[PDB]
Amino acid sequence: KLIDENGRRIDGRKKYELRPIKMEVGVLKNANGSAYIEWGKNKIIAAVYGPRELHPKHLQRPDRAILRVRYNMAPFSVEERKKPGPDRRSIEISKVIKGALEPALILEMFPRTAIDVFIEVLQADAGTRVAGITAASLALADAGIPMRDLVAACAAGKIEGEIVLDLNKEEDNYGEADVPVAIMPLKNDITLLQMDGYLTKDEFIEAVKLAIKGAKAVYQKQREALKEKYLKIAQE
Amino acid sequence: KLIDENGRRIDGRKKYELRPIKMEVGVLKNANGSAYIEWGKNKIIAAVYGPRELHPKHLQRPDRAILRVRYNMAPFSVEERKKPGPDRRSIEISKVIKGALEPALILEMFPRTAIDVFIEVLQADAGTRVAGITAASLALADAGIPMRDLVAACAAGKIEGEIVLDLNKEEDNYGEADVPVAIMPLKNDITLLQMDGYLTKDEFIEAVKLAIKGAKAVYQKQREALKEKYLKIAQE
Amino acid sequence: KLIDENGRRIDGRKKYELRPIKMEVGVLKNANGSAYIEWGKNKIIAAVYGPRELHPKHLQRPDRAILRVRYNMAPFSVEERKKPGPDRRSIEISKVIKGALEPALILEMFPRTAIDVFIEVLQADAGTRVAGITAASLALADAGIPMRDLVAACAAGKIEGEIVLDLNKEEDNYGEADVPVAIMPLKNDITLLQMDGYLTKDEFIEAVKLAIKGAKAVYQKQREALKEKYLKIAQE
Amino acid sequence: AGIMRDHIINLLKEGKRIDDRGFEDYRPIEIEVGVIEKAEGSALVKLGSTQVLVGIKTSLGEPFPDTPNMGVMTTNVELVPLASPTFEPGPPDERAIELARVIDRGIRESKALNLEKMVIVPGKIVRVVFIDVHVLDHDGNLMDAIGIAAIAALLNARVPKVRYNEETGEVETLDETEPLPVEKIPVPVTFAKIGNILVVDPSLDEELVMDGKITITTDETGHISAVQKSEGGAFKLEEVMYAVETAFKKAEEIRKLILEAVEKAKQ
Amino acid sequence: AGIMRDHIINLLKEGKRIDDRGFEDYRPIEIEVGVIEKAEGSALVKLGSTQVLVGIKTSLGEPFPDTPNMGVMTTNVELVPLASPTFEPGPPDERAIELARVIDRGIRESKALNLEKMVIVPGKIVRVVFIDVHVLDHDGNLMDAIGIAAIAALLNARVPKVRYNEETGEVETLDETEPLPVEKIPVPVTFAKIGNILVVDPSLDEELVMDGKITITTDETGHISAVQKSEGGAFKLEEVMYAVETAFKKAEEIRKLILEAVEKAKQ
Amino acid sequence: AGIMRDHIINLLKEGKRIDDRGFEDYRPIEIEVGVIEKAEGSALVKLGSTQVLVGIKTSLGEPFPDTPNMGVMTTNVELVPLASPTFEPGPPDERAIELARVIDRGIRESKALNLEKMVIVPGKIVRVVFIDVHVLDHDGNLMDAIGIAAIAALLNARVPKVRYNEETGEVETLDETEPLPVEKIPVPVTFAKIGNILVVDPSLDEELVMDGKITITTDETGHISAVQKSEGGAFKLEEVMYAVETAFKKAEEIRKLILEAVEKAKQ
RNA sequence: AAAAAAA
RNA sequence: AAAAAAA
RNA sequence: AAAAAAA
């Protein structure tokens, strides 16, 4: 305390300001598509393989690809070294990130295949899941995977009684609510929505609307990351 | 002490008295057959699936179904919360319960299939394995699985130098022997026999004979549980 | 200290003396080939199965057998009881022992199959890996597996500033380097080479050359173990 | 099986559900509390044919280094193989893990179990509360069934009175029991989005065809203590708003059943 | 392979077994104790071609909260992949677990290892005894081979004399060793039921065709310390009675071999 | 795919590698240290397209019973699935385990991290150093990339100054940081043997066709702190000698890049 | 084909 | 189809 | 295709 001075946050961000975000696509040689995101102190890499052969066969769906997501934090990504392994949290995040990406994907285009999304969090600082989904979309697009839209994501939250955009760790730690949202911006289709905290209906809804504005500005940044890539190939 | 007064047990049961037993068949929607048993303070549910497709194929037997048993205690079923997971004991009990049920089953009727038996112990109080086998038989019969006989089971034991029927936890805890038996009552075919303790030959044999009389009275109760079910379908 | 008196080691071995080694082939009924080795206080059994059907199929190679190695220490093989389980060390040893044996094997002779090598260390006392590879070769030969050569193995090491042959536990414990080598002696082909310690180039090379002389004398003992076996079958 | 989507969607178009429920109706609910008498608390909940048992077991243990002033609560969901052919033996899979965490969050973040009132010796000895969820029959809507059962079991829980003896320095566990400090009654309410329609308390057949799902957990005080869009699909902001509002309404109807069950077991 | 059942059953009808053994004969037994000199005790047992090694390792540790007056004994059976193509790497499967537990029970429940004589400081420091069973070649009858080896290894065991120094309050581990307090010699005897015939010490080929199996573990004192009908099949009460009685007889013949091996290693 | 061996072997016969490197050339190396600012140390290393990140995190913990005078170092390599389609999720497989151990050995056995200078209270409180290796893109030669990254991250590491307060008896963690006691710079250099030719820093395409591989890890002082022939194949004694000698040369060229990166991050 | 939450 | 090194 | 027993 105070996470909101007057009316500035500990890093000097205003209530509706995002942390600095940099994203880049095509950062891995092995992966079919990849994106790297630095979102505040988050440093996150996303890879996609392929659509690819799905073995065990039993897992195959006859009409469509399956999406598999693994979100993982590197041991050195958090203040207290994290034992490698997944953990309940990373498994749940993997689940909601899959559920965030799946609707953007035209999965029936590649029957019987897997699309594997990997999110490695190299440094964590609150908002890894929304920054992960954001890099994941980029990686899917980077993989040439046909998509209805990108998925852009951003968290809004409550700190010191006030609805704010894009919590950092400190703010989330001492905060009253964290509300990550992912959207497919073109149709305003919410593919991820979580709320950890305690809000009134009105608070919650303003958080979601705020988070979406944040997601929309992240979406501008994704498109620009994609444009960047298409300018790179336009050479020569 | 004293687990045997004169000549009454702590709950007032005589030496050859069973705890109160209630059993009911068809208690689950998903399972192919199911039975619930309240045997003393044991509360146990048994489910059967199906005969069903057995994958991995390698596991299939060409001439017969396989029986698979999993006995499991819920964390809150015992005085000290039990970490979920199986444990050596529940794995061994699963093994002997399979070996208890298998002979009752006409497994060659369904080549290449699995019959999966699940015993969940919701509250434990000594005799879960024999009460589990008993509900398991009911669940197998409830599943329409052709059987040579039901398997009924009951434990006898030694407390304060005396052979008694159907130990409760206290009695088993401070007891000298526990002797669960399962039988196919029609042919007096013993499909489960264990002895944990230290007995003379004579003691052991009297325990087994006693346990069988207990199993036979449990068997009456199974048949009655099955009759109950066939009266229910006879409507209208 | 002193692990080198003048110039004798704690068990009275000279610097270039091996511990007492006994080896015998065909000690198991189930395994396709087996060897037992007592090398100092090492007591190690190696088994081979077969070439045999390799399931899961995906693992099969179309042109060749695969070699799989598991090195394992029994709980009671070490001073402090070793929890059963493999461990990083036994997994790495399994890996280098496979990489030690593989080149001796004419794997394309048995496409799509597995050759499974098992090394159980019943008592450990430094040099289990080289004694394991040595018994493993014998077990492979005992299995009638066509081989370009036996693989013989021996460790050399540095104790009290001096390059010595075949460390025992004490010597390895208080030693400056341990250098196991495995060779296919006929062509002087080094199939295993490890160095744990800190040596000059010259030290390291003399250790390797020494270890090879040790491996060559172990190789004489393998051949003699094989001769022994062929004398046994020559009856009648 | 896919034949089912079309039937379900089309019925939905006619304002109908396969079992004749309204879009906002729960299947019949049965809550029975204190059924595992060995446990400190318990609740058997049935949402139609979905059945879940929750047992509460408590002990005394050390708090987490970071929170020496809070008792401990931990939530585990076992999707036991007997409950569903989709449930395989083994450690919790992502479904079980998400159910546990969302339900835990609903309780934790509303402070429905007040962990601060579970301290015996600050920094050393606190009450440890295991919420152990045994799903017994999966016929859809585990999330709500598990949260209803969890909070009903916590309300049912009677735990040994514990006293720190100031003179011997020992903690004494008494025979007398007391409730847990349960102060709020969060209830998850869960909707399936099927096409452009949300339907509360989706049965398995509805979950089989849904596009996506959203759970809103709310307490008596008008607060939301958890939200979880789960599975795929997408919701419109106005669908969420609808869900939140309808949640509060359905949660309240459910809280009444919970309090009734809780009170009945004291009869 | 199934061709084998018919041959085995028919031979059995003629009072014969494939290896010309009587129905009540063990295959040749070899017991050699103290073979792993690093361990505190050990026994290599061969029942025909079945071979199992057991090592005893002891240390000092805390007793279990509930039993501050008892040392610790724990039994593990490793069905090592080298012993049998049916043995796969990994944690103990149900076969290994049942073998461990039945053999443990035979020793535990007969108090053959007297845990009360393994206390150094009540409630704080007791001897911990690991019975580690390494099955080296599975040619049938692991249960008896493992129990014979286990008790022979315990009889072979020499453990550091330990003294609680009353003045420094430290425990001192001395060089002098002493036996473990082994007071009974439980021996499992195991029968295969093949058709209507029980045959003691079934080889693998007999286990392959048996209907079921029963193990009776008895000590010198005429007591049964474990019984385990294992695998499927069914026994008649009179078959059990026969098994118990024949067990005591065979166990005694085996105890003599155990004591002899144990005594030989002291030569 | 096997088409590739023949092309690679034949090019090798003409003194050529697929990427026009000499037999003794590394692919371009990029070392960037201190990239994970939350960690105490870190290094991103690229050998061509192989990329590995290493993070150093330290805490204070108890030393191992046997070594109360040494801090703790532990090395883990995660072959994360994103790095390679050959990398599957789960605990470290033998590749990851061998990489960790060989790299650990290179550091440990050269005392490059001096564990003796990591003691706070002998026998009770030492620095614990986790070398956590996150392989991000596997394009061959993980061993060298991981060792370069590991030692560069250790050189980059700044850890809280810690003082044992002699009066309160507490350990105090200060804000001021200090380097770790890094005293040597072991660098693994790794060769692929392809036919009769060794080629340093094998790319994946070369690893795909190699016969075998050997890693020599050496420090500034002319000492070898680890050697590991890995995978199959066989080396001649004269190939090893060549490898050792060439290692020292290549390690030195690499040490210069490491020191430069390390120094640059202090700019 | 097995004592958490936050990061 | 998930705090080591040595033994 | 990896420190138990009892409950």
Question: What is the DSSP track for A112-152?
Answer: TEEEEEEEEEEE--S-HHHHHHHHHHHHHHHTT--BSS--E
Encoding tokens for residue B218?
Answer: 């449990």
Helices (H) and strands (E) in chain D, counts: 5, 12
Report the 3 state secondary structure along C176-215: CEEEEEEEEHHHCEEEEEEEEEEEEHHHHHHHHHHHHHHH
What whole-number distance in Å separates Cα of residue E129 and Cα of residue E71? 8
Q: Is B212 helix (H, G, I), strand (E, B) or coil?
A: helix
Cβ contact A27:A34 at 8 Å: yes
Q: Show residues of chain C in contact with E100, CB under 8 Å.
A: none
Name the burial class of residue F15, with classes exposed (0-12), middle (13-18) and buried (19+) by CB atoms within 10 angstroms of its CB: exposed
* Distance in Å, residue A134 CA to nucleotide H2 C1': 27
Q: Which of D97, D234, D245 faces A201 most closely, judged by CB atoms? A: D245
Six-digit token pair at E53? 């090694």
Q: Which CATH number applies to D1-267? A: 3.30.230.70
Instruction: Provide the 3-class DSSP secondary structure of residue D80.
Output: coil
Q: A128: Cβ under 7 Å from strand G?
A: yes
Question: Among all chains, which residue has been given the structure tokens 């699995």?
Answer: B114
Q: Where are the alpha helices (DSSP H) in chain B?
A: 88-101, 128-142, 169-173, 201-233
Q: Considering CB atoms only, which of A41, A45, A124 is closest to F82?
A: A45
* E220: phi then psi, degrees, rounded to nearest 5: -60, -15
Measured distance CA(B177)–CA(B159) in Å, rounded: 7
C110 inside domain: yes
Torsion of CA E67, E68, E69, E70, to 10 degrees: 60
Smallest CA–CA distance from E220 into chain B, residue: B200
Is residue B209 within 8 angstroms of chain E, CB to CB?
Answer: yes
Opening angle at CA F153, ends F151 and F158, nearest 5: 120
CB–CB of A101/A107 below 8 Å?
no
* Phi, psi (rounded to 5 degrees) for E174: -90, 165
Mapping DSSP to helix (H, G, I), strand (E, B) and coil, where does residue C94 land?
Answer: helix
State phi, psi for D193 to the nearest 5 degrees: -90, 120
What letter represents residue F27's amino acid? R
**Residue E238 CB partners (closer than 8 Å, separation 6+):** none
> CA–CA distance from D126 to each of B101, E65, F201 (Å)?
45, 20, 56
Domain boundaries of chain F, sorted by first residue: 1-267
Instruction: Answer for the pair F54, F62: CB distance below 8 angstroms, yes or no.
Output: no
d(CA E201, CA E146): 12
D91 Cβ contacts chain G strand, under 7 Å = yes
Q: Is C205 in contact with F224 (CB distance < 8 Å)?
A: no
CA distance B186 to B149: 7
User: Which bases of chain H are under 7 A from a protein CB atom?
Assistant: 1-7
Domain containing residue C76: CATH number: 3.30.230.70
- List the domain range (segments joined by +) for residue A216: 16-236
H or E segment to which residue C131 belongs: helix C128-142
User: Can you tell me the distance from the alpha carbon of D253 to that of E143, in angstroms, rounded to the nearest whole number?
Assistant: 60
Closest nucleotide to A55: CA versus each C1':
H1
Closest-approach nucleotide to residue B175, Cα vs C1':
I6
The interface residues of chain E toward chain C in range 208-267, judged by CB-CB distance below 8 A, are none
D162 vs A36: CA distance, rounded Å:
53
Residues recorded for chain E: 267
Which nucleotides of strand I come closer than 7 angstroms to any CB of the protein? 1-7
| Residue B201: inside a domain | yes
Alpha-carbon distance E149 to F129, whole Å? 44
Within a domain: B6? no
Per the CB < 8 A criterion, the answer to whether E160 and E174 are in contact is yes
> How distant, in Å, are the alpha carbons of A132, F117, F152, F175 from that of F181?
36, 6, 13, 18
CB-based contact C195:F106 (threshold 8 Å):
no
Interface touch C212/F237, C-beta < 8 Å: yes
The reply to whether the CB atom of residue D108 sits less than 7 A from any atom in nucleic acid chain G is yes
Q: From its phi and psi, is residue B71 left (phi > 0), alpha (psi between -120 and 50) or beta? A: beta
Q: Is C116 on the interface with E (CB under 8 A)?
A: yes
CA distance A186 to chain D (A): 12
Query: What are the angstrom distances between the C-alpha of C217 and each of C18, C99, C183?
Result: 9, 21, 11
The candidate with the shortest Cα–Cα distance to C126, out of C185, C196, C75, C69, is C196
Give how far the C-alpha of residue E111 lies from the chain's centroid of Cα atoms, to the nearest Å.
14
| CA atoms of C73 and C84, how far apart (whole Å) | 8
**C113-123 and C152-159: which strand pairing?**
unpaired
Contact assessment for residue D161 and residue D174, using Cβ atoms and an 8 Å cutoff: yes
Q: Which amino acid is at E80?
A: V
By the 8 A CB rule, do C76 and E42 touch? yes
Domains: count for chain C: 1
| Rounded CA separation F220/D245 (Å) | 70
Half-sphere exposure of F160 (CA within 13 A, CB side): 19
Q: Which residues in chain E touch residue C76, judged by CB atoms under 8 angstroms apart?
A: 36, 38-39, 42, 54-57, 130, 132, 134
Among all residues of chain D, which has the CA nearest to that of A102?
A: D232
- Chain centroid to Cα C87, Å, comes to 18
Largest CA distance in chain D: 72
Assigned token pair, A115: 């699309």
Alpha-carbon distance of B148 to B106, in angstroms, equals 7
Contact (CB, 8 A) for A71 and A93: yes
Closest chain A C-alpha to F214 CA, distance in angstroms = 24
Q: Tell me how crowded residue D118 is: count the other CB atoms within 10 A of its CB.
A: 23
Strand E171-179 relative to strand E158-164: parallel, antiparallel, unpaired?
A: antiparallel
How many Å apart are CA D160 and CA F104, to the nearest integer? Answer: 51
Do residues E80 and C121 touch, judged by C-beta distance below 8 A? no
Q: Which chains neighbour C (Cβ–Cβ under 8 Å, 3 or more pairs)?
A: E, F
- Reference E1, options E227, E213, E211, E204; nearest CA is E204
Instruction: State the smallest CA–CA distance between residue E173 and chain B in angstroms.
Output: 33
Residues 136-165 of D with CB under 8 A from B: 136-139
Q: Which residues in D lie closer than 8 A to residue B45 (C-beta atoms)?
A: 82, 136
Backbone phi, psi, residue C207, to 5°: -60, -50
Long-range contacts of A106-110 (CB under 8 A, 24+ apart): A106/A146, A106/A147, A106/A148, A107/A64, A107/A65, A107/A66, A107/A67, A108/A63, A108/A64, A108/A65, A109/A51, A109/A64, A109/A65, A109/A146, A110/A51, A110/A64, A110/A65
Q: C89 to chain F: which residues are within 8 Å by CB?
A: 101
Query: Resolution to 1 decimal, in Å?
Result: 1.9
Question: Do A126 and D135 contact (CB within 8 A), yes or no?
Answer: no
Task: Name the minimum distance, in Å, from the CA of E214 to any CA of chain B.
Answer: 8
Question: Which chain B residue is nearest to residue E196, measuring alpha carbons?
Answer: B189
C-alpha to C-alpha distance for B96 and B130, rounded to whole angstroms: 10
Q: Which residues pair with C113 in a beta bridge?
A: C53
**Which residue type is seen at F63?**
P
Q: Strands, DSSP E only, in B14-132?
A: 21-25, 33-39, 42-53, 66-73, 113-123
C vs D contact (3+ beta-carbon pairs below 8 A): no
DSSP string, A186-203: GGTEEEEEEEEEEEEHHH
Contact A177, A196 (CB under 8 A): yes
According to the entry, how was the structure determined?
Answer: X-ray
Secondary structure (3-state) at A28: coil
Rounded distance between C-alpha atoms, residue B128 and residue F14, angstroms: 75
